[PDB]
Amino acid sequence: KTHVQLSLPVLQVRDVLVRGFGDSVEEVLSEARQHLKDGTCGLVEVEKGVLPQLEQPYVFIKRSDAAPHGHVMVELVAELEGIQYGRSGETLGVLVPHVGEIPVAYRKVLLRK
Protein backbone atom coordinates (compact mmCIF):
# COMPACT_ATOMS: atom_id res chain seq x y z
CA LYS A 1 0.00 0.00 0.00
CA THR A 2 1.20 3.60 -0.74
CA HIS A 3 -0.11 4.71 2.71
CA VAL A 4 -0.37 2.99 6.11
CA GLN A 5 -2.54 3.99 9.10
CA LEU A 6 -0.31 4.29 12.19
CA SER A 7 -0.93 5.46 15.78
CA LEU A 8 2.36 7.07 16.99
CA PRO A 9 3.12 7.42 20.69
CA VAL A 10 3.81 11.09 21.58
CA LEU A 11 6.86 11.30 23.90
CA GLN A 12 8.09 14.08 26.20
CA VAL A 13 11.55 15.20 24.94
CA ARG A 14 13.17 14.67 28.40
CA ASP A 15 12.02 11.03 28.47
CA VAL A 16 13.53 10.09 25.10
CA LEU A 17 16.37 7.60 25.54
CA VAL A 18 17.57 7.38 21.88
CA ARG A 19 17.50 10.94 20.57
CA GLY A 20 17.81 10.29 16.80
CA PHE A 21 17.97 7.65 14.08
CA GLY A 22 21.61 7.94 12.91
CA ASP A 23 24.34 10.05 11.41
CA SER A 24 23.31 10.97 7.81
CA VAL A 25 20.15 12.24 6.13
CA GLU A 26 19.83 8.98 4.15
CA GLU A 27 20.34 6.81 7.30
CA VAL A 28 17.83 8.70 9.46
CA LEU A 29 15.10 8.53 6.75
CA SER A 30 15.85 4.78 6.25
CA GLU A 31 15.78 4.00 10.01
CA ALA A 32 12.67 6.18 10.60
CA ARG A 33 10.79 4.24 7.87
CA GLN A 34 12.01 0.90 9.30
CA HIS A 35 10.91 1.86 12.90
CA LEU A 36 7.53 3.12 11.53
CA LYS A 37 6.97 -0.31 9.82
CA ASP A 38 8.10 -2.21 13.06
CA GLY A 39 5.89 -0.12 15.43
CA THR A 40 8.98 1.19 17.29
CA CYS A 41 8.76 4.91 16.32
CA GLY A 42 7.75 7.77 18.63
CA LEU A 43 6.82 11.39 17.96
CA VAL A 44 7.97 14.52 19.87
CA GLU A 45 5.92 17.69 19.42
CA VAL A 46 8.23 20.57 18.42
CA GLU A 47 8.25 23.60 20.75
CA LYS A 48 10.91 26.08 21.96
CA GLY A 49 13.90 24.12 23.33
CA VAL A 50 12.96 20.68 21.91
CA LEU A 51 15.22 20.33 18.80
CA PRO A 52 18.46 21.32 20.64
CA GLN A 53 17.77 18.38 23.05
CA LEU A 54 17.62 15.91 20.09
CA GLU A 55 20.33 14.69 17.69
CA GLN A 56 20.71 15.84 14.06
CA PRO A 57 19.98 14.85 11.40
CA TYR A 58 16.28 15.27 12.41
CA VAL A 59 13.34 13.39 10.78
CA PHE A 60 10.05 15.36 10.74
CA ILE A 61 6.56 14.21 9.90
CA LYS A 62 4.91 16.95 7.81
CA ARG A 63 1.25 17.25 6.65
CA SER A 64 1.13 16.17 2.93
CA ASP A 65 -2.51 17.25 2.27
CA ALA A 66 -5.78 18.67 3.85
CA ALA A 67 -7.58 13.48 6.95
CA PRO A 68 -9.04 10.00 6.20
CA HIS A 69 -10.54 8.00 9.18
CA GLY A 70 -9.08 10.63 11.63
CA HIS A 71 -5.52 9.94 10.23
CA VAL A 72 -3.65 13.07 8.95
CA MET A 73 -1.68 12.23 5.76
CA VAL A 74 2.02 12.83 6.44
CA GLU A 75 5.39 12.41 4.79
CA LEU A 76 8.98 12.34 6.06
CA VAL A 77 11.40 15.32 5.67
CA ALA A 78 14.98 15.20 7.13
CA GLU A 79 16.97 18.23 8.31
CA LEU A 80 20.77 18.65 8.74
CA GLU A 81 22.56 21.98 9.51
CA GLY A 82 19.48 23.97 8.48
CA ILE A 83 18.89 22.23 5.09
CA GLN A 84 15.75 20.06 4.52
CA TYR A 85 15.58 17.01 2.22
CA GLY A 86 11.99 16.90 1.12
CA ARG A 87 9.33 19.59 0.69
CA SER A 88 6.00 19.27 2.60
CA GLY A 89 3.42 20.95 4.88
CA GLU A 90 3.23 21.84 8.59
CA THR A 91 5.41 19.83 11.06
CA LEU A 92 3.35 17.41 13.28
CA GLY A 93 6.55 16.52 15.19
CA VAL A 94 10.03 15.05 15.15
CA LEU A 95 10.38 11.23 14.99
CA VAL A 96 12.61 9.29 17.42
CA PRO A 97 13.08 5.61 18.21
CA HIS A 98 10.59 4.32 20.77
CA VAL A 99 12.20 1.98 23.33
CA GLY A 100 9.36 1.76 25.92
CA GLU A 101 8.98 5.39 27.07
CA ILE A 102 5.45 6.12 28.37
CA PRO A 103 3.59 8.40 25.94
CA VAL A 104 1.38 11.41 26.82
CA ALA A 105 -0.91 10.90 23.77
CA TYR A 106 -1.17 9.14 20.38
CA ARG A 107 -1.10 10.86 16.98
CA LYS A 108 -3.06 8.99 14.24
CA VAL A 109 -1.35 9.46 10.83
CA LEU A 110 -1.60 8.05 7.31
CA LEU A 111 2.08 7.66 6.36
CA ARG A 112 3.06 8.01 2.70
CA LYS A 113 5.29 4.84 2.51
Side-chain angles (χ1 to χ4, degrees), residues 56-68:
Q56 294 192 52
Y58 310 124
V59 175
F60 301 108
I61 46 152
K62 285 183 169 292
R63 189 190 214 99
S64 48
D65 169 39

Side-chain angles (χ1 to χ4, degrees), residues 5-6 11 15 17 26-27 29 44 53 56 62-63 70 77 80 86 91-92 102 104 106-107 111:
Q5 281 179 359
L6 303 170
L11 311 180
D15 281 344
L17 297 179
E26 293 160 81
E27 182 180 20
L29 288 167
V44 181
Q53 293 185 74
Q56 294 192 52
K62 285 183 169 292
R63 189 190 214 99
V77 172
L80 178 56
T91 294
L92 277 77
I102 304 308
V104 297
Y106 288 86
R107 198 71 210 256
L111 170 68

Side-chain angles (χ1 to χ4, degrees), residues 32-109:
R33 294 194 164 95
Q34 193 65 49
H35 279 80
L36 287 161
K37 173 229 171 118
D38 298 345
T40 59
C41 190
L43 178 67
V44 181
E45 287 184 329
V46 177
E47 286 197 331
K48 296 295 191 298
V50 168
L51 289 171
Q53 293 185 74
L54 296 174
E55 295 170 334
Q56 294 192 52
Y58 310 124
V59 175
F60 301 108
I61 46 152
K62 285 183 169 292
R63 189 190 214 99
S64 48
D65 169 39
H69 312 270
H71 291 254
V72 171
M73 289 185 45
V74 299
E75 53 201 344
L76 305 187
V77 172
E79 178 180 312
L80 178 56
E81 295 163 353
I83 300 171
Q84 297 197 333
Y85 300 85
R87 161 174 221 266
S88 189
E90 193 193 343
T91 294
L92 277 77
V94 53
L95 299 181
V96 294
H98 186 216
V99 297
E101 301 95 330
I102 304 308
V104 297
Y106 288 86
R107 198 71 210 256
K108 295 187 288 178
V109 303

